Design a protein around this ligand. Structure first.
Ligand SMILES: [Co+2]
Ligand SMILES: [Co+2]
Ligand SMILES: [Co+2]
Ligand SMILES: [Co+2]
Ligand SMILES: [Co+2]
Length: 155
DNA sequence: TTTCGTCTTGGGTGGTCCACG
DNA sequence: ACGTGGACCACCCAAGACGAA
């Protein structure tokens, strides 16, 4: 939010455009000696990336930049991951390209991942969002059901 | 080369919604 | 006679891998 925080760099700024410009040119762009974020609190410190285009997407965490805009006139939602914008898209249509494929369900998602939750969870059997308050033994399929409990109940 | 493509896997929030205790 | 608990979903989004452009 308007100011590099790359280790040592001190450019404050005016527009996302510029900052998210400076990074790719200043820090991520050039060099032939390995790409790693060096941003303040980076949850990976220096867990280098494989390719360097991968770092580049990562910053969008740090930067805030969701550059894949939606097209459907009127709507103005970006994302910062292509995959995402793709799905955000279908919703404008109803496109559920992604059927629960396996064992014999026939239900489908606008996207792959939600198809994989449902997919594993809804045909679960186990419930691994077990609450961890002693004298409960309360477990659910999804973090949401859990979460609601450990706080409607405990907490 | 590197980057994409698209999938897999995985860490979240807000909620409907209704059935059964 | 019935309230809520919790299964299931919608959106959120990071990142591997591995091959294709
Ligand atoms: Co900088
Ligand atoms: Co970082
Ligand atoms: Co849109
Ligand atoms: Co299914
Ligand atoms: Co509990």
């Amino acid at each position: 939010e308007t100011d590099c925080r790359w280790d040592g760099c001190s450019q404050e700024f005016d527009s996302q455009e510029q900052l998210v410009h400076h990074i790719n040119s200043e820090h991520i762009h050039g060099e032939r000696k390995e790409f790693v974020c060096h941003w303040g609190g980076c949850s990976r410190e220096l867990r280098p990336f494989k390719a360097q285009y991968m770092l580049v997407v990562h910053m969008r965490r740090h930067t805030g930049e969701k550059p894949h805009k939606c097209t459907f006139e009127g709507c103005r939602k970006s994302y910062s991951r292509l995959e995402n914008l793709k799905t955000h898209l279908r919703s404008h249509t109803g496109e559920k390209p992604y059927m629960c494929e396996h064992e014999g369900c026939s239900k489908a998602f606008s996207n792959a991942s939600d198809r994989a939750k449902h997919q594993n969870r809804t045909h679960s059997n186990e419930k691994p969002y077990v609450c961890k308050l002693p004298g409960c033994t309360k477990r659910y399929t999804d973090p949401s059901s859990l979460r609601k409990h450990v706080k409607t109940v405990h907490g």
